[PDB]
Amino acid sequence: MIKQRTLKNIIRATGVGLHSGEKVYLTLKPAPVDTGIVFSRTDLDPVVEIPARAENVGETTMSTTLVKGDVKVDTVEHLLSAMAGLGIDNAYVELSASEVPIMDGSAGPFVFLIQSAGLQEQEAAKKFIRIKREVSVEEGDKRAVFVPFDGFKVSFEIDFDHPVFRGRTQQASVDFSSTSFVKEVSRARTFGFMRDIEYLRSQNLALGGSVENAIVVDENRVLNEDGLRYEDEFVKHKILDAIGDLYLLGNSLIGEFRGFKSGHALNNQLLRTLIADKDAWEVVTFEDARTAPISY
Ligand SMILES: CC(C)(N)[C@H](NC(=O)c1ccc(C#CC#Cc2ccc(N)cc2)cc1)C(=O)NO
Ligand SMILES: [Zn+2]
Ligand SMILES: [Zn+2]
C-alpha cells in the first residue's frame, strides 16, 4: 500500500520573516500517523498549536496566514508547498515568531531541509482526496478551479500587460506524471513590482525583503543581476504557491488545479467551497501502489 510519510529526524534552520523582518528559528519534527502538519509557536507561554487546515486560514491578501484567536503564523505557503511536493503527511513545525522565514523566496530551502532530515514511511495508508466534480470560484477576472483528473496536475495562467512580461509565456501546465516538483517547480522565487514593494516598505512592511530573496521587476525589466532561474519562473512560482495553499486540504490531491490570475484568497475560498460539498470529492487509498495514478 501507499503509506503515510513523516520525517526521519528533527531538522532546523534560521531566517527572517519577509513581512516582519524578524529573525526566526524554524524546527521541523516527525509526527505520528494522522497528525497532518501542525504549526507551533514555541515562543509563547503557553505554546500555541495551529493545525494546518483550510478552516484555520485568516487574512490572505499578502500571504497565507494561519490563525488561532489572537495568535498567527504568517507565510506558510512555501514551506507547505515543499511538504506537499515531497509527500510529507505528518510533521510538527516549530517557530520562534509569527512568520515562517522567507529563506531565498522559494521552496528550495525547505526541500533541502526535508531531504536532509530524511523520509520515514509509517504503518498507515496514505489518504488522497479525489476530485469527482469540477468546482470553481472567482472574483472579477480571477478564477480558481478544481477539475477531475486521473493524476495530479497544476495549470496556471497569469496575464500581465506590463512591458517586462511581453513575450513571456505566462502559462504553464505541470503534469506530475512526468515533471519533478523538486527540479522544475521548487526553486521558483517569489516576485514583486517595485511600485508595490515601495508602497509596502513605506508603511514599514516587507521589512525582510531583499534582492537576495525576491525577484524585483519594474515596468520594463527584471532588476536582479542574474535574471531568472527558470525561463518561466513567474508562473512557476504561482504554481508553487498553489500547491502549498492547496495542501491545507490536509491530504494529497488526485485531480487538476487550474488558476487564472488567482492568489491565496481564491485558493482558500476554493478549498472551503470544495470541502463543504461532499458530492464533489471522495477519500481514496491505494492498497497496490501500481494501481495509483500518482507516485511519491
Ligand atoms: C508573488 C505573490 C503571490 N504576490 C506573493 N509575494 C508577495 O506578496 C511579495 C511581497 C513583497 C516582496 C518583496 C520585496 C523586497 C525588497 C527590497 C526592499 C528594499 C531593498 N533595498 C531591496 C529589496 C516579494 C513578494 C507570494 O509569493 N506569496 O506566497
Ligand atoms: Zn504597466
Ligand atoms: Zn509565494
Numbering used by the authors: 1 to 296
What does the paper say about this structure?
In this study, we used solution NMR to investigate the conformational states of small-molecule inhibitors bound to LpxC, an essential metalloamidase that catalyses the deacetylation of UDP-(3-O-acyl)-N-acetylglucosamine during the biosynthesis of lipid A in Gram-negative bacteria. We chose Aquifex aeolicus LpxC (AaLpxC) in the lipid A biosynthetic pathway for structural and dynamics investigation due to its exceptional thermostability, which has enabled both NMR measurements and crystallographic studies (for example, refs 13, 14, 15, 16).
Taken together, these solution measurement-derived rotamers collectively portray an inhibitor envelope that can accommodate three substitutions at the Cβ position of the threonyl head group. To test this prediction, we merged the two conformations of the threonyl head group and generated Cβ-di-methyl substituted compounds with the third Cβ-substitution containing either a hydroxyl group (LPC-037) or an amino group (LPC-040). Excitingly, the Cβ-triply substituted compounds LPC-037 and LPC-040 both showed enhanced LpxC inhibition, displaying Ki* values of 14±1 pM and 12±1 pM, respectively.
